[model samples]
Target: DPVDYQAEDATIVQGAVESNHAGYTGTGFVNYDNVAGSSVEWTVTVPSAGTYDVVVRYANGTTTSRPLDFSVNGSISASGVAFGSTGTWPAWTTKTVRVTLAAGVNKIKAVATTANGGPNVDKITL
Candidate 1:
């Protein structure tokens, strides 16, 4: 089954939930604190072991890219994944990356790598 996890529902570390931005698909989105290493962690229940696409919905208003590191179970699945601009803070877009997951319980995380922090993250679907 396909499922979508809202960023606001995840464990937010050094971030805030905000609905000030438009075009978001949940109660609100998570704005990573204006520093590096801030993150959002989500628990994922897997029915079976497989490679899955993790789709992240976010918005970047500035010209510079605000990349994030996607990881699973404390392991790096990918690093510095690009989250380019949407030209407006209220605007949104999605980026997809594949990661392998084991059956049963697991954790997924998105961590900011720069002072700008991650984009305004809305949700992730798998």
Candidate 2:
């Protein structure tokens, strides 16, 4: 049996890498719209009540420091946290935030509110 099951397939919230960032062992991407300096929202429905592994990746080429805010079920989960990436264009880092969900639908949104907004993202299971 799967430890984590999605009522509907997990969807991409925002900012996809133009080139593939997926690997042999990682969660894949979906519903990603490429737009910088803007907010992206992804929706997911919970099939069962359990702790689910949620991984989120974000990157920006134009930032040395920025606070990435993450919201789960309309509450702030991560705020003003620094996520680092290499010197490559569209560099990114992934964070694993464990969340418990009741049997229902949950909303996840990652927003970058900074001057150097160059942000891109993806979500995976781990």
Q: Using TM-score as the measure, which candidate wins?
A: 1
lDDT of 1 by residue, 1-126 (tens): 678899999999999999998888879999999899999998888789989998889999999899899899999999889899899998889899897899988899999999998998999988
* Deviation from native of the Cα of residue 21 in model 2, angstroms: 8.2
Alpha-carbon lDDT of model 1:
0.91
Clashes of each: 0, 0
Clashes of 1: 0
How far out, in Å, is residue 51 in model 2? Answer: 4.6
Predicted structure with the largest lDDT when compared to the true one: 1
Q: Candidate 1 at residue 33, lDDT?
A: 92
In candidate 2, how many clashes are counted?
A: 0
TM-scores, all candidates, are: 0.96, 0.57
